[PDB]
Design a protein around this ligand. Structure first.
Ligand SMILES: C/C=C(\C)CC/C=C(\C)CC/C=C(\C)CCC=C(C)C
Ligand code: NA
Length: 152
């Protein structure tokens, strides 16, 4: 448990806690929503396509999304409300997922240059919804569905 984050389980997982060691790969679906009346969806892995797949970089120093994932069991579906303090990073993080969904490598030099240039010129991440999210810091809910943990 971390401050500013409420976990709710909507479908209980199966089995013992996955082995969430350094280098293991987590396959999951997720949906991100505002906390407005409509619960406006910001991103939805199922809608766009295939599930996300991340590698735990270091079990001893977890990324924020790893803090979420490593609390989960296979097949679990949980909703995590995260206060404004945890979510200011989400728009750039979504930016980068969205470009990888496309054919673009956000780490390639021409892509990253264009991003910084448009961001300085136009104060934009390339996406109206993420821009409005960054201009208005606020809570988000992430619903995550954990599908599979693979050993390294
Ligand atoms: C590289 C990171 C990959 C993904 C698929 C990030 C989306 C996953 C989440 C659990 C949402 C991020 C949660 C916070 C920033 C609190
Ligand atoms: Na399901």
């Amino acid at each position: 448990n971390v401050e500013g984050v409420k976990k709710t389980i909507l479908h209980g997982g199966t089995g013992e806690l996955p082995n969430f060691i350094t280098g293991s790969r987590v396959i999951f679906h997720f949906r991100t929503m505002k906390c407005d009346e409509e619960r406006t969806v910001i991103d939805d892995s199922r809608q766009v396509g295939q599930p996300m797949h991340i590698i735990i970089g270091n079990m001893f120093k977890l990324e924020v999304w790893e803090i979420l994932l490593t609390s989960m069991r296979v097949h679990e579906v949980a909703e995590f409300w995260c206060d404004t303090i945890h979510t200011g990073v989400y728009p750039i993080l979504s930016r980068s997922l969205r470009q990888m969904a496309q054919g673009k490598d956000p780490t390639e030099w021409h892509v990253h240059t264009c991003g910084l240039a448009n961001m300085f010129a136009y104060h934009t991440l390339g996406y109206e919804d993420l821009d409005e999210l960054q201009k208005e810091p606020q809570p988000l809910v992430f619903v995550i569905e954990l599908l599979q943990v693979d050993a390294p």
